[PDB]
């Protein structure tokens, strides 16, 4: 999502 390249995403 917009947790940069790291999940969750």
Aim: charged share 0%.
């Amino acid at each position: 999502x917009a947790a940069x390249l790291l999940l969750p995403x």
